[PDB]
Amino acid sequence: DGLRHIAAGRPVPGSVHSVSVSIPDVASVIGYESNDAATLSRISWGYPRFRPHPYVVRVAELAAREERGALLLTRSARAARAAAAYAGLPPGAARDLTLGGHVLSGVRLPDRGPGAARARAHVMHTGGHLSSRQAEDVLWDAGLIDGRQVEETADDSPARAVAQALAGAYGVPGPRYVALRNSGMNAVAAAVEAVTEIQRDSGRRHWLQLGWIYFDTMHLFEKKVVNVGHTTVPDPFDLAEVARVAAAHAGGLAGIIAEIPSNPGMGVPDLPALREIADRAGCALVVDATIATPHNVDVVPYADVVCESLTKYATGSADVLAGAVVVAPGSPFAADLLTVLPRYGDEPYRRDTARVAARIRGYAERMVRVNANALALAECLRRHPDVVRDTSWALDTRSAANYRKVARDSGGPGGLLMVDLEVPLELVYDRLAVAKGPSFGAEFTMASPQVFVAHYDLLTTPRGRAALRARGLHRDMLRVSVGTEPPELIVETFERALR
Numbered sequence: 001d002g003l004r005h006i007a008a009g010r011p012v013p014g015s016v017h018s019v020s021v022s023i024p025d026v027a028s029v030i031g032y033e034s035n036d037a038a039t040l041s042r043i044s045w046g047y048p049r050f051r052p053h054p055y056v057v058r059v060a061e062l063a064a065r066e067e068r069g070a071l072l073l074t075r076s077a078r079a080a081r082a083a084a085a086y087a088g089l090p091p092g093a094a095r096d097l098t099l100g101g102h103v104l105s106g107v108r109l110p111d112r113g114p115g116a117a118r119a120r121a122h123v124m125h126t127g128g129h130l131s132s133r134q135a136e137d138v139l140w141d142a143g144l145i146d147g148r149q150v151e152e153t154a155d156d157s158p159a160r161a162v163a164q165a166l167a168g169a170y171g172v173p174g175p176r177y178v179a180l181r182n183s184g185m186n187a188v189a190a191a192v193e194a195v196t197e198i199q200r201d202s203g204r205r206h207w208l209q210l211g212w213i214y215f216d217t218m219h220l221f222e223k224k225v226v227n228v229g230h231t232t233v234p235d236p237f238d239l240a241e242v243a244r245v246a247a248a249h250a251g252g253l254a255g256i257i258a259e260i261p262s263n264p265g266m267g268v269p270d271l272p273a274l275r276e277i278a279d280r281a282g283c284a285l286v287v288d289a290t291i292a293t294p295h296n297v298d299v300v301p302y303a304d305v306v307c308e309s310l311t312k313y314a315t316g317s318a319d320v321l322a323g324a325v326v327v328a329p330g331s332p333f334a335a336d337l338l339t340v341l342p343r344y345g346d347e348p349y350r351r352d353t354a355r356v357a358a359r360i361r362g363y364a365e366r367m368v369r370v371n372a373n374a375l376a377l378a379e380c381l382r383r384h385p386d387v388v389r390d391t392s393w394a395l396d397t398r399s400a401a402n403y404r405k406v407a408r409d410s411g412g413p414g415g416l417l418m419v420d421l422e423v424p425l426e427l428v429y430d431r432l433a434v435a436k437g438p439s440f441g442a443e444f445t446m447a448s449p450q451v452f453v454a455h456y457d458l459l460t461t462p463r464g465r466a467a468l469r470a471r472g473l474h475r476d477m478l479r480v481s482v483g484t485e486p487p488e489l490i491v492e493t494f495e496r497a498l499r
């Protein structure tokens, strides 16, 4: 059902639990990212960490009625307590509520002050939100909705099934080394918090962020959602600078965090070299491998901890959030990580896990087709030098050598291409017949105006645009996430939009 125009505002793929939404022209993108009220009425749906799902909103409204007058719902009481503490709210702000025979946890937010924004940010950047499947079950059990979304699930021991599948894909001995979390960000946050606690006793409290990486991961450090010091090394290829910064913090580095490739710039760091630096520093190396997938790269030998957002290609359905933490068995930190990790983050609601268990069965086969499509589209983009200024991806001239260091013999580039345009984004994006909107990693091809998604605020002024330019980014860029459609049809779809 891919490669078609989707009407603006329709949830994508269409399920009640859809994580994306059609935002098919740049005018709508600007209206959406600038919170224009008319645009948000037309396009009210969004990614569930960024725009609360309507069922979650309804559950919060009804749980508040039963003092009465804002409630931010969370996945767990633990998450509510953490968001309240981070936001500076009194401990009683985190409360447990009931509706339809279910226990709910959330934070009562103040009407004035920055407390409400801080609590919302904590829940957002750590993925500690209540899922739409859990809210749907609350409403259905209470008799407040007629029916539930029908979908394929694998309900028999789904957390074990998912953890076993990931253990095999990552090459670790078994599910003992895999922890499932509420979303990709919940996994990243749990891994960072667990490493931080293990390292605290030795006086190691500082983190190095390698390059510009996923924006919510950057916000975890910048906003001190995780309460550590940090330094960003802006060039992920700049190993001499990485070593210089590590030497300046010698004996004080808790960890280095890196992505392979990075979101959205698509830079591939030198993981073997980073392992040697981390070994000399006594710090942990945490690697987010979402964009490559474990079917394309073997990074466990070099990382102490690997994180993945299962929301993307692991499911291919654009309809469930989940994350995974994989602890390397050979890491010096492994025993402590397995002891400490249960204290951080939350497992997904089990109905979400059962959806992942059904969808993950096709992961390896999915990636064979995705890899071939990305290779075919990259060649197409190179043949349009009057429209495409460059394409950043795993096998470009910046990243190919580093990628080959960890790529599997069967391994391909993954599905993501970051397209830098010589024309205004409107001239390509508005006419492109793919699913345009947030998230990526579906079996249908998607595209995102990703600089607007991550950095709309910086796009709006000259100095903000200068800051983005220093990161290699600008307005007229399109992140493409190829699906599993026939490669000739994907190529033809892009040829029609590029001319």
Ligand SMILES: [Mg+2]
Residues within 6 Å of the ligand: 390, 392, 420, 472
């Ligand atoms: Mg460039």
